[PDB]
Amino acid sequence: ERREGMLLNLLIPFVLTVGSGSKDSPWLEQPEVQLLLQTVINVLLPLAESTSQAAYLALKVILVCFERQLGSQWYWLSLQVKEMALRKVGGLALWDFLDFIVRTRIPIFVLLRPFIQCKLLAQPAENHEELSARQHISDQLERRFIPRPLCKSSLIAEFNSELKILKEAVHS
């Protein structure tokens, strides 16, 4: 009943302020990055739609801003994301998270490529809303390179815009 406000008012703004601004962000130490990742996943794994969307946005922000700080922590993150996909934690916008992962090709994309390609796409679609996202992900997987990343500025702008949109949608 208070994690949503923390995610949308403190955690996401904090990660945006600290991680962005430079290629490397040594302001935050490794234990703090671990704690933030645990907090986000605990909002995710052990859910409301808006809460899930905020959690996934925070997960994207932490993955991108704190990519270097994560270091040897990609296999566990891949396992957690695989569990999220198996549980259908997001329900909606989980496909948006996977589409983001495929777009940015973040270090977890190489680990999650087999599950998304051979396994996840094998499962039939339920609704047209998820069908469109699944088709977009499949198109982005093969025969589509689209090198979008550029000095992390576009990603941070996207995160800030999505945060503003979600903040405006929550109060309304």
Binding site: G71, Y75, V110, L111, S153
Partner: protein, 345 residues
């Protein structure tokens, strides 16, 4: 079949009885599951000699649909097992690779991240080569999208198994070059990454009219950022070798791309985290490019009006002093090795 249930219960409680049950499973399978693999995957978490006996059952079963998921999970063991089990896992993978598609790339992402011994991933690549026609794309994916500490071993193995990648002296390759060059900027074996990236750029990147505009623009932007990053590096023996080899390769490639594709060369140097800081960074990048005589009179006439207009408009009126030490360093004939006179400048 009750032995499987006993094994599951023992695992839930926790090789006295589990090892004996695994041996029973192996000897039962040898004489002649689908329902057994649910505990076989759990055997990976069971272990945290004994691991060799655990994987001997899998080695018996593999020659004996879902098999496509078998290697990755087994390869996943490399990320949790103690260091001594890595050799046994590599040996089992090599031995049982004969009965053994993209997941193998992700395999390297593990094998090149947790195992410090070159021999492990070298043998993995050797056994993948005999069953994968194009293993270079796996390493390209690893370098382009994987994190650091995975890029160095992947680059080293890529250059080891492909001696043709050394010049005398498509999209995935461009992304790999971009990542390899970004490694140097992130650093500011770090210099080895820059050296290998420049070698690969000279080898398998020839600008032409057939090159996609976006790919060439990204490549040139990363080249300029890498030049700026390498400018401030300290001068050591490796530093001296880098600073001596770079005019031979990077300057030559920039000259070639400018001669062939001038539009991208101009577009990359245009001004296009604060706006003032970004303009200062771009101006410093141009100033760093200047000593290598990359900028000709055409480049100057094409880029300087836009930079001055951006300074006049985008930058506020805070005395503009922040840019002074840059601009005063770019508009001096003595400071810059440009053959430009006052009329030309």
């Amino acid at each position: 079949a009750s032995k499987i249930r006993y094994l599951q219960e023992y695992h839930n409680r926790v090789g006295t009885d589990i090892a004996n049950t695994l041996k029973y499973f192996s000897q039962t399978l040898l004489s002649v599951y689908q329902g057994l693999y649910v505990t076989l995957v759990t055997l990976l978490d069971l272990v945290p000699d004994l691991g060799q006996s655990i994987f001997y059952t899998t080695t018996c079963l593999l020659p004996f649909d879902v098999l496509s998921t078998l290697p990755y999970t087994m390869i996943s063991t490399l990320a949790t097992f103690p260091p001594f089990l890595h050799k046994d896992i590599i040996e089992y993978l090599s031995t049982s690779f004969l009965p053994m598609n993209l997941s193998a790339s992700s395999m390297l992402m593990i094998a090149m991240q947790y195992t410090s011994n070159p021999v492990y991933h070298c043998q993995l690549l050797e056994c993948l080569m005999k069953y994968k026609q194009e293993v270079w794309k796996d390493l390209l994916y690893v370098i382009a999208y994987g994190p650091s500490q995975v890029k160095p071993p992947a680059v080293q193995m890529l250059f080891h198994y492909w001696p043709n990648l050394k010049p005398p002296g498509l999209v995935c390759a461009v992304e790999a070059v971009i990542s390899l060059l970004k490694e140097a900027e992130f650093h500011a074996d770090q210099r080895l990454l820059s050296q290998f990236g420049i070698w690969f750029l000279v080898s398998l990147c020839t600008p032409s009219e057939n090159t996609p505009t976006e790919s060439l623009a990204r490549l040139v932007a990363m080249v300029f950022q890498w030049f700026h990053s390498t400018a401030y590096m300290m001068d050591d023996e490796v530093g001296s070798l880098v600073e001596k080899l770079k005019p031979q390769f990077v300057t030559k490639w920039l000259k070639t791309v400018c001669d062939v594709r001038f539009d991208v060369m101009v577009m990359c140097l245009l001004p296009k985290c604060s706006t003032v800081t970004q303009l200062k960074e771009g101006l410093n990048r141009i100033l760093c490019l200047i000593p290598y005589n990359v900028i000709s009179q055409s480049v100057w006439e094409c880029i300087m009006p836009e930079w001055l207009e951006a300074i006049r408009t985008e930058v506020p009126d805070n005395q503009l002093k922040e840019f002074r030490e840059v601009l005063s360093k770019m508009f001096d004939i003595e400071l810059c090795p440009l053959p430009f006179s006052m009329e030309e400048m």
